[PDB]
């Protein structure tokens, strides 16, 4: 009756950072030393919980969120930081209690001659709220003059592509991220 963690971590293809997926786990047996004692996870750090103490803690609900971001950008995944992701893409409330995982997936996502399947927002009027996401692709407004759906001046399409490539520097190499939130 073990939890489906495997299909989340051994999944085929991940979503984009601005359109991250969300899954609910409840009424299940979850083991973590199998996840904890793995050399795969280049980065693995938790908050408010001892990583060894998970087996002693029960919860009503567990939420798993995943996406794909650039390598030298994982630092933005922490409660109380700034940056494009932490501003317009994914927010972490400071009262966070859960683990954050990230490992290099260069051999799974990057492709020769650019991979143009992953996006991220660049413009938005106001910052996000904790555990909140948006998908709308309305043309951004940057001045008092309204343009009404034309990408002329001061009206920019708010989505750009990462364009991963398997020969880039390790800073730009892609990274998969899994975020756990608790009761």
């Amino acid at each position, epitope marked *: 009756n073990l939890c489906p963690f495997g299909e989340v971590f051994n999944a085929t293809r991940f979503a984009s950072v601005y359109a991250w997926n969300r899954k609910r786990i409840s009424n299940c047996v979850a083991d973590y030393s199998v996840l904890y004692n793995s050399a795969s996870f280049s980065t693995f750090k938790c908050y408010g919980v001892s990583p060894t103490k998970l087996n002693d803690l029960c919860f009503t609900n567990v939420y798993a969120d995943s996406f794909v971001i650039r390598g030298d950008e994982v630092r933005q995944i922490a409660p109380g930081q700034t940056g494009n992701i932490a501003d317009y893409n994914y927010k972490l409330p400071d009262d966070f209690t859960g683990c954050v995982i990230a490992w290099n997936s260069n051999n799974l996502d990057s492709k020769v001659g650019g991979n143009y399947n992953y996006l991220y927002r660049l413009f938005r009027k106001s910052n996000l709220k904790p555990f909140e996401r948006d998908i709308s692709t309305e043309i951004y407004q940057a001045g008092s*003059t309204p343009c009404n759906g*034309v990408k002329g*001046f001061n009206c920019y399409f708010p989505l750009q592509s990462y364009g991963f490539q398997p020969t880039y520097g390790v800073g730009y190499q892609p990274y998969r991220v899994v975020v756990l939130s608790f009761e």
Partner: antibody
Amino acid sequence: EVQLVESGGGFVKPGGSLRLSCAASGFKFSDAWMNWVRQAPGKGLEWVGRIKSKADGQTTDYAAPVKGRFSISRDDSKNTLFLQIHNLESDDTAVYYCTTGALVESRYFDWFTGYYFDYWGQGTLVTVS
Amino acid sequence: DIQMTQSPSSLSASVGDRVTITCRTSQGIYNYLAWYQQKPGKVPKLLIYGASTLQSGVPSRFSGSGSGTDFTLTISSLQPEDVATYYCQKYKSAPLTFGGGTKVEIKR
């Protein structure tokens, strides 16, 4: 300060093709939008095409009497722009420029959007005989 | 296809006088327009943008005034070193089409 240089003009003969180039100097040229403008002898200027930044589509917007010809392409990793004149008829005899424009930033990122043209090259002269 | 005119074309007055240049438009553009100056045999140079903002480092005798559907650029006083052709450019969106062009001569 920053400069752009172009080359490739010659005393060519019609019924063929020609390749023109423009090399950037001090931009963050990987992500900027660049333009070509062709000044005919003794006539006004005329915009002839734009190419995006390849991080936002790498699309091309040509002019109304141009759509059929004058292909534009970008070669990164060496900071070079490329205008491909697909066919010369008579009136391609003109001068050509490579220009960029406004700088726009929101909080973190900035890039020459190229909407009103600030920096111009010396301008190479093309002929049809 | 918003047609624009830059009229007239033959303009000339004794030094110190005032000149009017008018970039009319067929469709409304809020304030998006620039002006370029090009002396004979050289690259054009920028003067204005937003229809009124002077360039940082250009003489301040040019007056970008209008907005809406008809614009005016006027030189406050004439000098003999500022004879060139001036170009008004539509600026809202593609296809960034320039203007016809106006030359300025000098009086007798």
